[PDB]
Design an enzyme around this catalytic site. Sequence first.
Site, short mmCIF file in Angstrom:
data_model
loop_
_atom_site.label_atom_id
_atom_site.label_comp_id
_atom_site.label_asym_id
_atom_site.label_seq_id
_atom_site.Cartn_x
_atom_site.Cartn_y
_atom_site.Cartn_z
N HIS B 29 12.71 3.53 -4.31
CA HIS B 29 11.92 2.63 -3.47
C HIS B 29 10.44 2.74 -3.79
CE1 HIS B 29 9.43 2.35 0.30
NE2 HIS B 29 9.85 1.11 0.17
N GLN B 30 9.93 3.96 -3.97
CA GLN B 30 8.53 4.15 -4.35
C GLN B 30 8.26 3.59 -5.74
OE1 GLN B 30 7.93 8.35 -3.88
NE2 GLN B 30 7.53 8.21 -1.67
#
Lengths: 298, 187
Positions: B29-30
């Site tokens: 996600h990052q």
Amino acid sequence: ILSTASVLAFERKLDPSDALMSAGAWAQRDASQEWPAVTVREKSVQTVDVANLPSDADTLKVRFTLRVLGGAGTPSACNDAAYRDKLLQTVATYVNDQGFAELARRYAHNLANARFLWRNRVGAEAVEVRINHIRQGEVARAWRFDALAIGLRDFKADAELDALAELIASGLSGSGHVLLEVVAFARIGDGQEVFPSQELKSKTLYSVRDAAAIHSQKIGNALRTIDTWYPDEDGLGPIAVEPYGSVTSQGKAYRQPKQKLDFYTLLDNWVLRDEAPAVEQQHYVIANLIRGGVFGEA
Amino acid sequence: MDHYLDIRLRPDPEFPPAQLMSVLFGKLHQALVAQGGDRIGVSFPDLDESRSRLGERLRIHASADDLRALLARPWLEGLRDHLQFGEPAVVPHPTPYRQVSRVQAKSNPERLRRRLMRRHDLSEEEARKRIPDTVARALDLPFVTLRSQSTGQHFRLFIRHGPLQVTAEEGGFTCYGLSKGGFVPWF
């Protein structure tokens, strides 16, 4: 006859101090002296205990001291003197076969990678371990490892590593006293939640004095993770050196007693019937003698 | 969308694989927040629907250049011990396509009551009489658990794989790899 002693208490070698944590910024770890320690806070969700970094920090400061004692084969309380003499002869024979070479190297690995940072290493993009050798209150010899290069699965070599290996081996043999201040530095992120060892407000996090901490026995169980000589399947890495090779995460116990690879059958083969096991099995046996135990019959 | 990469969690004597799935999901996600784009898919190859289990592998579907930039991104540091992966190889040709969706839930009645304070300025008893405590939604779907830097509360992200269709649809992907209309192959 040469039976096993009824009491066979063994003290723990490689005594770990109670590991704290603290918060700070990367590239200020050279000035990591007055870093403010994180605190266990009660938060209402039912109220639970949470520990996390502040806003102006991204690095953990887990600090503990490890003492290497020596006299690994000597029991603290042995019922039988003949069994104690035979076991001391067997451990001394192991020392002449190898002078705590591989065990001290793997323990220097578990110091070198932050396996004592159990859940504070998974989300970290940069992990650093600093080990100072305190002798008469002064830093005799410093080390600054990197847990990113030193993997948690393979068992490699490095020059400063081998220096730490000879230091731990000299501590385990009994030729000196080794006291190591180990300070970890993991870039877990800005204000991210950390994982101290948990006490049993449904769930509480253990601390010592206005500052959250990790338990000594967690650091000890992390340091014991050198055992790769179990009948490994499914690509599992090293496990902790335990009697009957058990792990709580998988819910299963390697080195099953139905096989002849658990620690107690290897002891009764090694020191009673003179059935000397393999080099790896006796490495595992001496590691289990280093960790201590309550061994003996009933 | 033609290439896929399988990341399998190597088993750990310290952690059950659910936290490894959560950490890998937060790291990807990052990476997807930092990189940008919406042609990056997410699947679960051994997703068993018997006990809503995630499995032990994860599948990423994307293009060649996007996956090369994803592997060139330094998000993968610190995860090499717990995960192992091959190469961004192409998907097989006769593969049916299914969608992946994030199904949230209104599990807290008090959160919606505090919302209705900010929309109609009603009282607490009006909120309790209008919305009872039985409005909480129990969702029997596989899920991962995550925390955010923007919002410090710990949130659960439910993942549901759609019915197996016969073709793909042109749609984007979210930053979690979930589809806002996209589809991923199944094999």
